[PDB]
Design a binder for these strands. Structure first.
Ligand SMILES: [Mg+2]
Ligand SMILES: [Mg+2]
Ligand SMILES: [Mg+2]
Ligand SMILES: [Mg+2]
Ligand SMILES: [Mg+2]
Ligand SMILES: [Mg+2]
Ligand SMILES: [Mg+2]
Ligand SMILES: [Mg+2]
Ligand SMILES: [Mg+2]
Ligand SMILES: [Mg+2]
Ligand SMILES: [Mg+2]
Ligand SMILES: [Mg+2]
Ligand SMILES: [Mg+2]
Ligand SMILES: [Mg+2]
Ligand SMILES: [Mg+2]
Ligand SMILES: [Mg+2]
Ligand SMILES: [Mg+2]
Ligand SMILES: [Mg+2]
Ligand SMILES: [Mg+2]
Ligand SMILES: [Mg+2]
Ligand SMILES: [Mg+2]
Ligand SMILES: [Mg+2]
Ligand SMILES: [Mg+2]
Ligand SMILES: [Mg+2]
Ligand SMILES: [Mg+2]
Ligand SMILES: [Mg+2]
Ligand SMILES: [Mg+2]
Ligand SMILES: [Mg+2]
Ligand SMILES: [Mg+2]
Ligand SMILES: [Mg+2]
Ligand SMILES: [Mg+2]
Ligand SMILES: [Mg+2]
Ligand SMILES: [Mg+2]
Ligand SMILES: [Mg+2]
Ligand SMILES: [Mg+2]
Ligand SMILES: [Mg+2]
Ligand SMILES: [Mg+2]
Ligand SMILES: [Mg+2]
Ligand SMILES: [Mg+2]
Ligand SMILES: [Mg+2]
Ligand SMILES: [Mg+2]
Ligand SMILES: [Mg+2]
Ligand SMILES: [Mg+2]
Ligand SMILES: [Mg+2]
Ligand SMILES: [Mg+2]
Ligand SMILES: [Mg+2]
Ligand SMILES: [Mg+2]
Ligand SMILES: [Mg+2]
Ligand SMILES: [Mg+2]
Lengths: 47, 274, 93
RNA sequence: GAAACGAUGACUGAAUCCGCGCGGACCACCGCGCAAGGCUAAAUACUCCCAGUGACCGAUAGCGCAUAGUACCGUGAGGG
RNA sequence: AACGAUAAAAGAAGUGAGAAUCUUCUUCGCCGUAAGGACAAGGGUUCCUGGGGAAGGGUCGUCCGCCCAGGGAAAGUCGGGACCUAAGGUGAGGCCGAACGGCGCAGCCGAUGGACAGCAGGUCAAGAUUCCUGCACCGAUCAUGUGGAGUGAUGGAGGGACGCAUUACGCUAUCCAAUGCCAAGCUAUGGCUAUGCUGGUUGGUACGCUCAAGGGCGAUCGGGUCAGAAAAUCUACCGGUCACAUGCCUCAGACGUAUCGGGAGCUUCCUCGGAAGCGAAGUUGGAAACGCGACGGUGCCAAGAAAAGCUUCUAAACGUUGAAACAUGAUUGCCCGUACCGCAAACCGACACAGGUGUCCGAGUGUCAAUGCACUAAGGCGCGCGAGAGAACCCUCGUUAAGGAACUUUGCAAUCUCACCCCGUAACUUCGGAAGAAGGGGUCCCCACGCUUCGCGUGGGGCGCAGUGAAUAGGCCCAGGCGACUGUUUACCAAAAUCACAGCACUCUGCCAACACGAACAGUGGACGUAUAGGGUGUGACGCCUGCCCGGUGCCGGAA
């Protein structure tokens, strides 16, 4: 019928982004633990 | 007294409605009309602490100073008796002879425009701010504080009357509406009379909607739920209990005193609400 | 400075006829402002500028082999002078 | 457990030299000791990185990759 | 097997190496409250020009939303920011907490909202309240003037400021009629020769003693200190005083006049067809909004956000020979968003997928009306495999002799029935109802007559098998079980007898209330509620009612 993924720019960014991911400890942690895996895709800010 | 309804719709029989024919029709004073948002029962953690709260109709706060001692020693005159959706009672509009308007709670009878006072130097009339000691023995009153200046926290629902059993020490004995006898520091304030609305108690709600319109989301028998959900759950049929009646939290409902056993109030209650 | 900014001129059927009208059109520098561009061309062309417009444009992401890439994004700017004050250096094109 | 000693949470908070602490309950004896103040290189651990070697691999091996955390999947963490 | 809806295609012409599929032409078929148009969210160059044809395309492709290259997007007035606040998120000091951290007043962030200055036309292959033409508006700084003494905040008040339903008068959009006006040519196939046929028939701005329904509306003096910390030309109370009808005030809109547009077409050039010039009329009559006048009227209980801009007072403060206000000229105009797809082949569905996606506009005819049904207009398509065959069988549909539920687990399915009017209508009842019960009869075309019209009754005639002639369009009844009722429910095998409910009942709870979330004496819900309130539990409208057992368990109380 209708689907799981209905994009929302403001949602996307205010949810997964960088100011967001750094706002919390475990997101700092997500950050550097990504960086280590050599992500080009650091964060949905980087889309 | 109460409006009623011919049975044109199934639910438009038992339904009943207030008598607001004595309500000075008016959009409550601007500099007194704060904004109440609703709270699903969730608190600042977003979990439903209170349970079963939901929507209804947009409401606003009308500040009703209860400590009249901010303007006692002078009088005001009643200007209107408008309709507050947040109180079980009706409220009235004070025009203080010296400018300032206020809102106070409205008692039983008090006709629109009677000029009422405030101060220990006040006549036992309906609507007077009067300390509890200066109140006659056996007089009828409401709006009673648990300390001078705090705020009136007693007798506020429709047609309620705390009754001066009489003085004693500096703590005046008092008859709470619940059927309880309470000591009150005679420097406490009062507002003479029964609350009024009174008719309230009786209005038949009539249909689901009418519950919703006051924002009381549908209540739920745990006897519906399942084990996982709540105590009385499970079973194979419109099932009994199998344990003693009990809240979701398992702390018994039906005949279990719940007040905290040691307390500071325990030497101000001469009797029990029985 | 009063030059750096004007990263190029604009080349097309449009641009040409606008020129013919007395309206000149350049690529500029994304970060720039309209006050900045006015000051720019007014300085390095000794002209009375009374009309302006700008517009940031993306950049045709193109591939050259397995290398999907975006081009640099520009800021097309249009200016209209007063009293047929045509600019010399482009008047031959 | 016969539970010494240290160690602290709550109550108690002694002696300072003819004194204090321990010697696996506890006592005498007889021994080892100076609580309540601090710093301290050295040997030791690791290895993102640099170099040298190899009864280690040579394209399903070897890191995941002769390179790429890319293509691709995932709203995301993440997988790859 | 399948090539992704049974909306449908033909012939000619062209191009090419090659054509059922690409491009012209002439028809046909489908959508038309859409399958048209305009936005938003999302996508990201898919837009336009020229080219290409490996692969993507369910076939083919010379074609494309695919490949290449190049171009295209323009704002002081639209939308967002340079302003505001809601929920929410924050947040120095502050309150807490093994740590990371959790709270938290003011302040700040936060549009889905408040506020706010521009409209009409023209055009690129591709932009448009941006650019260009024509005539406006707003803020800002300076200058010549009218200056000629007050300006008026980080605080005051006013104002902003709001619900649903129903509805009166005026009006616009916008659509219909016509021997109104303008323009165009023609005679068809028996007639018509125009009184026929086709098309067009006012948009902006300015003024004007012209017309105008509707709508808002008081005023001034004085007192009280004690109301807004104080102030106070203000705001609020008290008092006095003022030609009730009103006038004061506004002008949606229309009429006039003017000016700028636009306008059917007509002309001229010419290159898979456009470039450019020109331009007539502008009527009476009727319908009519969910739009405007508007913050109108009335009724109702469930009782209807905040803040800035804004308007008024005063405080300091510098001025009171340059204080405001104003007219005019100059001058200035920041930041991003504007292409295109956007009910879909371009967004979400792995797909060029019978799904999903929020708001606006959505013409005409017939129809009691209507966003309903049939057919259409503008516009958009014929859904990217084709051709023939004309067996079984399968799907969707028509008709049906005699019979009419014999079927079967059961009338499952399918037919019946079908709109509007008029007659008429049961037990039972909570007097609302059942009820569209049932059951009848009418319905089209013409002429005359009346009536309030487009319209309708009446009377007589006419035709066909039949006249809501086509399409949209209830089968009905008798009697039980369960629930009272409207509602809710197992996303993707169960919609009910579930659940909720209004009602009643037991208890609990006197405020830092019980009760609930909680590192926790934090803070929060309960509640800015107060026993006619709040929690928990059970029954489940309404009506007559609700008995017998306190030994065990639980609970309340008691004390040797
Ligand atoms: Mg209940
Ligand atoms: Mg259950
Ligand atoms: Mg179960
Ligand atoms: Mg349990
Ligand atoms: Mg049970
Ligand atoms: Mg711009
Ligand atoms: Mg490309
Ligand atoms: Mg020890
Ligand atoms: Mg090999
Ligand atoms: Mg390998
Ligand atoms: Mg086949
Ligand atoms: Mg197809
Ligand atoms: Mg076919
Ligand atoms: Mg031809
Ligand atoms: Mg040829
Ligand atoms: Mg085809
Ligand atoms: Mg459309
Ligand atoms: Mg194209
Ligand atoms: Mg192919
Ligand atoms: Mg060719
Ligand atoms: Mg916080
Ligand atoms: Mg907004
Ligand atoms: Mg505006
Ligand atoms: Mg704006
Ligand atoms: Mg302009
Ligand atoms: Mg009307
Ligand atoms: Mg005619
Ligand atoms: Mg003829
Ligand atoms: Mg005509
Ligand atoms: Mg503010
Ligand atoms: Mg864009
Ligand atoms: Mg297709
Ligand atoms: Mg589709
Ligand atoms: Mg319409
Ligand atoms: Mg229509
Ligand atoms: Mg239709
Ligand atoms: Mg299309
Ligand atoms: Mg044959
Ligand atoms: Mg038959
Ligand atoms: Mg027959
Ligand atoms: Mg059936
Ligand atoms: Mg009857
Ligand atoms: Mg009938
Ligand atoms: Mg006949
Ligand atoms: Mg007949
Ligand atoms: Mg039917
Ligand atoms: Mg039911
Ligand atoms: Mg199901
Ligand atoms: Mg089902």
């Amino acid at each position: 019928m209708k689907r799981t993924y209905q994009p929302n720019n403001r949602k996307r960014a205010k949810t997964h982004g960088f100011r967001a991911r750094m706002k919390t400890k475990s997101g700092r942690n997500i950050l550097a633990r990504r960086r280590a895996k050599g992500r080009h895709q650091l964060t949905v800010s980087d889309e | 007294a109460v409006k009623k309804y011919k049975p044109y719709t199934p639910s438009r029989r038992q339904m009943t409605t207030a008598d607001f024919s004595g309500l000075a029709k008016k959009r409550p004073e601007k500099a007194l009309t704060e904004a109440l948002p609703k709270t699903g029962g969730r608190n600042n953690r977003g979990r439903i602490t209170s349970r079963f709260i939901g929507g209804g109709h947009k409401r606003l706060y009308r500040i009703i100073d209860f400590k009249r001692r901010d303007k006692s020693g002078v009088n005001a005159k009643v200007a209107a008796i408008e309709y507050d959706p947040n109180r079980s009672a009706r409220i009235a509009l004070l025009h203080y002879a010296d400018g300032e308007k206020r809102y106070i709670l409205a008692p039983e009878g008090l006709t629109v425009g009677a000029t009422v006072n405030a101060g220990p130097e006040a006549e036992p009339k309906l609507g007077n701010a009067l300390p509890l000691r200066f109140v006659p023995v056996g007089a009828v009153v409401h709006a009673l504080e648990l300390v001078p200046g705090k705020g009136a926290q007693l007798a506020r629902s429709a047609g309620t009357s705390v009754q001066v059993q009489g003085k004693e020490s500096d703590y005046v004995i008092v008859r709470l509406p619940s059927g309880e006898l309470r000591r009150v520091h005679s420097e406490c304030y009062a507002t003479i009379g029964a609350v009024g609305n009174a008719e309230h108690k009786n209005i038949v709600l009539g249909k689901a909607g009418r519950s919703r319109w006051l924002g009381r989301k549908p209540h739920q028998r745990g006897s519906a739920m399942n084990p996982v959900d709540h105590p009385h759950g499970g079973g194979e049929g419109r099932t009994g209990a199998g344990r003693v009646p009990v809240t979701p939290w398992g702390k018994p409902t039906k005949g279990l005193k719940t007040r905290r056993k040691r307390k500071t109030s325990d030497r101000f209650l001469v009797t029990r609400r029985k | 400075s009063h030059y750096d900014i004007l990263q190029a001129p604009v080349i097309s059927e449009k641009a040409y006829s606008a020129m013919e009208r007395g309206v000149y059109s350049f690529w500029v520098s994304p970060k720039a402002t309209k006050t900045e561009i006015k000051d720019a061309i007014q300085q390095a062309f000794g002209v009375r500028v009374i009309g302006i417009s700008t517009m940031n444009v993306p950049g045709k992401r193109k591939r050259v082999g397995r290398f999907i890439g975006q081009r640099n994004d520009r800021k097309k700017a249009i200016v209209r002078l007063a009293e047929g004050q045509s600019i010399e250096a482009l008047a031959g094109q």
